[PDB]
């Protein structure tokens with residue numbers, strides 16, 4: 468089971484407006500990884516310029532006291548995952564990210580490292596999407612075609628990051644985020660969808676899940692009214 | 708070739724705020740279908756309640772002087788397409804729509820009816836997406852998984868419907884529509900992306916294409932600055 472093995476920090480978004488990269492969650496990253504993790508394995512696949520992405524993430528994690536290895540600089544990404552002390556998958560285009568995880572044979576390897584070996588996993592945004600059962604509730608454009616929407620399944624429910632309340636000033640006739648999720652929940656056997664607004668994130672420790680941050684999360688359950696939850700809320704019931 | 712065979716009316720959105728279903732484009736529908744088309748074959752697959760969707764579309768098209776058959780009430784959808792005088796694919800969830808076109812074996816049948824038999828095609832929003840080479844530039848959530856993102860290819864370029872200018876009042880850190888398309892244009896061999904704002908639509912007659920409506924279209928070319936185009940603009944250069 469998961470009880471003493473699963474460690475996830477699932478961030479909705481990397482940056483608050485006017486703030487620094489990972490600044491709003493930097494204390495939680497520090498607590499989550501702890502003092503005994505020396506190096507973090509970064510996965511930059513969600514963005515096109517992997518070199519510049521790794522440089523940005525390395526600057527921040529080195530400022531936090533961690534070395535940073537990018538899997539795109541490893542000659543054997545599978546081996547890099549098998550040796551990682553901690554894994555951070557950054558945001559970007561979720562379809563591009565998931566296809567690249569499949570293309571580099573990393574789905575099973577990351578699953579084993581996190582769920583069986585207890586290696587801590589950080590996701591930001593698209594990296595949070597691929598931590599879930601599937602990317603059915605990403606906001607991103609399908610710029611490439613992954614072989615499946617199934618992802619790492621580190622948790623069995625879906626997440627909608629960057630969750631956005633409807634705009635009352637708006638005459639735009641496109642779907643609201645809630646309307647899009649409602650349509651998902653018309654399809655067969657779909658699981659709960661956790662809408663993490665920007666500024667909030669989910670800490671998973673075994674079979675415990677906790678909302679952290681400074682904003683509310685909107686939970687979408689199939690056939691039910693959406694419910695709103697304050698930082699500190701216990702989401703353990705979403706875990707098996 | 709296409710010169711005297713292809714007839715498309717590609718609408719960005721069905722309804723102006725405060726207006727009626729297809730009201731803003733109803734005159735163009737009338738000119739496009741003409742007086743000799745008696746019945747329109749409707750494809751409601753983009754929405755979950757196909758019965759209610761067909762009822763809504765039937766009310767409008769009957770008010771415009773056309774009978775309406777919904778392919779979801781046909782016992783052989785392929786045969787219904789082969790006999791259609793005109794085809795209208797309505798908006799909804801583009802992934803759900805495309806998967807259902809594939810599931811009902813309608814991609815080839817619709818392609819033949821439109822491109823070889825000269826049958827007029829109307830798309831609205833998601834129905835405009837599936838008229839293009841692929842649905843890579845839909846705004847919709849991947850609530851189901853079609854076998855491919857390739858669509859009808861009635862035109863060889865991509866369309867982004869409901870195109871939305873960035874919000875200057877907004878502190879939301881999610882991608883702007885332009886940022887999403889730019890990422891598409893980082894992938895290999897991608898074609899032009901026509902951003903149809905709400906209120907504008909594309910009329911295709913053979914190898915001629917014209918912007919119609921009351922709003923501007925933003926054209927995205929790979930590696931180039933986006934360009935803005937007024938109603939009446941000649942987009943024929945996007946066609947082969």
Ligand SMILES: N[C@@H](CC(=O)O)C(=O)O
Pocket residue numbers: 480513557558559560561591592593594596604605606607628629881882
């Ligand atoms: N593209 C987003 C993910 C999403 O909104 O689904 C990000 O990684 O920032």
Ligand SMILES: N[C@@H](CC(=O)O)C(=O)O
Pocket residue numbers: 641642720753797798799800801831832833834836844845846847868869
């Ligand atoms: N879901 C939209 C299509 C899109 O925005 O891509 C519609 O059919 O209205």
Ligand SMILES: [Ca+2]
Pocket residue numbers: 480481557558559591592593
């Ligand atoms: Ca991010």
Ligand SMILES: [Ca+2]
Pocket residue numbers: 720721797798799831832833
């Ligand atoms: Ca529509």
